[PDB]
Structure formats: C-alpha cells, structure tokens
A paper describes a structure:
In initial experiments HEPES was successfully incorporated into apo NK1 crystals by soaking and bound into the lysine-binding pocket in a mode consistent with previous results. The piperazine moiety of HEPES makes strong carbon and donor π-interactions with W188 and Y198, and weak polar interactions with E183, whereas the hydroxyl group engages the glycine loop in weak polar interactions. A HEPES molecule is bound in the pocket and shown with its carbon atoms in dark gray and its sulphur atom in yellow. Hydrogen bonds between the HEPES molecule and NK1 are represented by dashed lines. All of the compounds discussed here, as confirmed by crystallographic analysis, show the conserved and crucial hydrogen bonds to R197 and the differences in binding affinity reflect additional interactions. This is demonstrated, for example, by HEPES (KD = 2.4 mM) which, compared to (H)EPPS (KD = 7.0 mM) and PIPES (KD = 26.6 mM), forms stronger π-interactions to W188 an Y198, weak polar interactions to E183 and further contacts with the glycine loop. Binding constants obtained from SPR and NMR are comparable and the figures indicate that CAPS and HEPES display the highest binding affinities, whereas PIPES and CHES display the lowest. Inhibition of phosphorylation of Erk 1/2 and Akt (S473) was seen for HEPES, (H)EPPS, MES, MOPS and CAPS at the highest concentration (100 mM, lanes 4).
The growth/motility factor hepatocyte growth factor/scatter factor (HGF/SF) and its receptor, the tyrosine kinase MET, constitute a signalling system essential for embryogenesis and for tissue/organ regeneration in post-natal life. Two truncated forms of HGF/SF are produced by alternative splicing of the primary transcript: NK1 encodes the N domain and the first K domain (K1),16 while NK2 encodes the N, K1 and K2 domains. NK1 is a monomer in solution, but crystallises as a head-to-tail dimer and all available crystal structures of human and mouse NK1 yielded the same dimer. (c) The lysine-binding pocket of the kringle domain of NK1 is formed by a glycine loop at the top of pocket (E183 and G186), an aromatic “base” (W188) and sides (F162 and Y198), as well as a positively charged anchor at the bottom of the pocket (R197).
Numbering used by the authors:
A (entry chain A): 38 to 210
B (entry chain B): 37 to 209
The structure:
C-alpha cells in the first residue's frame, strides 16, 4: 500500500487554517499509516496524505497535501511525508513547470536517471541548486519551463535526455 | 503485484483507429504479469499507460494510450480485461467534472461510496445504462448531470443519501 504514495523524506506539513480536520494515533510503522489512509476507515475525511513521525512512532492523517492552500512544508528529521498519488495532479499545465507527480519514464519508454546521479550522464541540475523544483528521485521534471514539458536524464548512455509523455490537462475533454 | 493499482474495465480491449500507434504483445500466464511489466515499463519502446489481458489467448497487450486517447476505441470481448494506469487518468477536475473518470470513491467526510449498480442503502435511477459516456462504474465519484456541486456519489451510509467528493480543480488561479 505504501509505492501509492509519493514519499518526501524529512518533511512534515503544518496547517494554518485550524478548521481543517486531522487525526493521529501512535502506530508501529509507516506502512500501517498507509494502510489506514488507503482504506480510509475511521477517518472523518478523505485521506490525501499522512506523515509518519519516526521518533514518537506517530501517524498523522490529513485531508490535504503540500499543494493545498494553507499548509507549509517544513524540514523535520524525524518525519516522512507521504502523499496519496490520486491528489497530486497527474497532468501538465502549459510547459509543466509545476509538475510534481511520480512519472519516471521517458516517451520512448526509458527509465529516467536520478537527479542525484551523474551516471551515465553528467549535469548541473542538482537537487540542492534549484529549490522549490522537486528534483527528487528520478521524476520527470521541467525546472526551467522549456518547450517540450517534463523530462529527465535517461538511464540509457546513448540518450542524454528525453521528454516524458505526461499529458496536458487540456488533452482530454 | 501491482495489478490492484490499475483501473479495471471488464470485457474490454482497445482498438487502433490510427494504424500509426504502437502496441507490444506477449504470451504469459496471469494478468498480474502484464501489470508488473507495465508498472516497471521494462522492454517497452514507449510509456505504458494501459494493458489488456486476453484470458483466452493468454496474452498481454501493452499500450502507450488508454480508452481516452484519440484514435482509439473500446471493443467488446468476454476474453479481455482492460487495466488503465492511474497515472494517465486525469485525477483532477475540469469545470464541474462532468468528464471526470478517476477512481476516487469516498465522499468529503470520508464515507465510502455506494455502487451505482446498487440500490442499497439508497434507491435511485442513476443506472449506468441510462448514463452512457458518464462511466458510472463501481462506486466512483461522478457528476453525470454536470451539476454545480462537482462529482458526488450515493453514500454507503443509510443516514446520508449522497455527498460531494472532494476532488481538486486542475487549474484555479
């Protein structure tokens, strides 16, 4: 069950609007958090994300994610954020600058190269340099809003980079 | 085993109008072997957005399109099951979401939706057959008449006849 979430390591979420519902429980592992979220039982809301507090072994279930108005991502070394993929927009607006989904495959079907790897291709698109852009794992991204939309470096040493095939939100009626 | 992560349409395969589009096929044992390969995208010269398992010919058919892509049509067959990769089924709403085909099946306050084909807990005349094109399948949140509220379902709570589901607008600035 865990993947169906995008994991952000060392991250939690804080609600500003205190009318947004929340539920917590001390649990054993993050997997048990995911299962409760996925099946959505005993939660008076739609579970869109949860955080696992690894220190207190606490599970925090939310009817929002990091793209919801009124919630701040924050660093915290004992937290992992998990976001339900159904609520991360899986289609691109324009050039796809704001694309944060988990597609990690190019249009000709090649598995993307992790941004934190210089094999087979070396590059100056570091996760560190480029904040807010979510150059995490091997996801298709478009950090500079360039023509063909979200892309990646390719695990194939003979294709430096290729765009992925993420649909426009305007593709289907 | 990733098969449970796809949206399943029973008794259905997909046909190419456009002869240009590409397909990969392979003889296998079970439907989850189609799923695993689609999810991993290994050996596919394209992005796998759907697959068909042919239960009579014991074949996977992997596709770089789904039932929504232009130049493709559904075809009936008792032997076929269609599995659509949720990453390529728009998970946000345009307008009132008359066209929404995602798989969210819980209401705003966390109630599991009642199946459209069911009259339990609630009786209604939103029969799938009366509402064609509107994909009133399983217990998914739908807005078959295009009303102000966005997608909704009859609720599995006898106390709550129906409720809106909480599905994000693709774009609202």
């Amino acid at each position: 069950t865990i993947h169906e979430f995008k994991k952000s390591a060392k991250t939690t979420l804080i609600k500003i609007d205190p009318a947004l519902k929340i539920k917590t429980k001390k649990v054993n592992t993050a997997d048990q958090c995911a299962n409760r979220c996925t099946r959505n039982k005993g939660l008076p809301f739609t579970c869109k994300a949860f955080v696992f507090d690894k220190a207190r072994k606490q599970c925090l279930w939310f009817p929002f994610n990091s793209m919801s108005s009124g919630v701040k991502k924050e660093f915290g070394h004992e937290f992992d954020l998990y976001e339900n993929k159904d609520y991360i927009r899986n289609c691109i607006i324009g050039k796809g600058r704001s694309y944060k989904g988990t597609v990690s495959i190019t249009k000709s079907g090649i598995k993307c190269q992790p941004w934190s790897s210089m094999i087979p291709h070396e590059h100056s698109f570091l996760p560190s340099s480029y904040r807010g852009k979510d150059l995490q794992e091997n996801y298709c991204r478009n950090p500079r809003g360039e023509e063909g939309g979200p892309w990646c470096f390719t695990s194939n040493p003979e294709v430096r980079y290729e765009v992925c095939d993420i649909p426009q939100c305007s593709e289907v009626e």
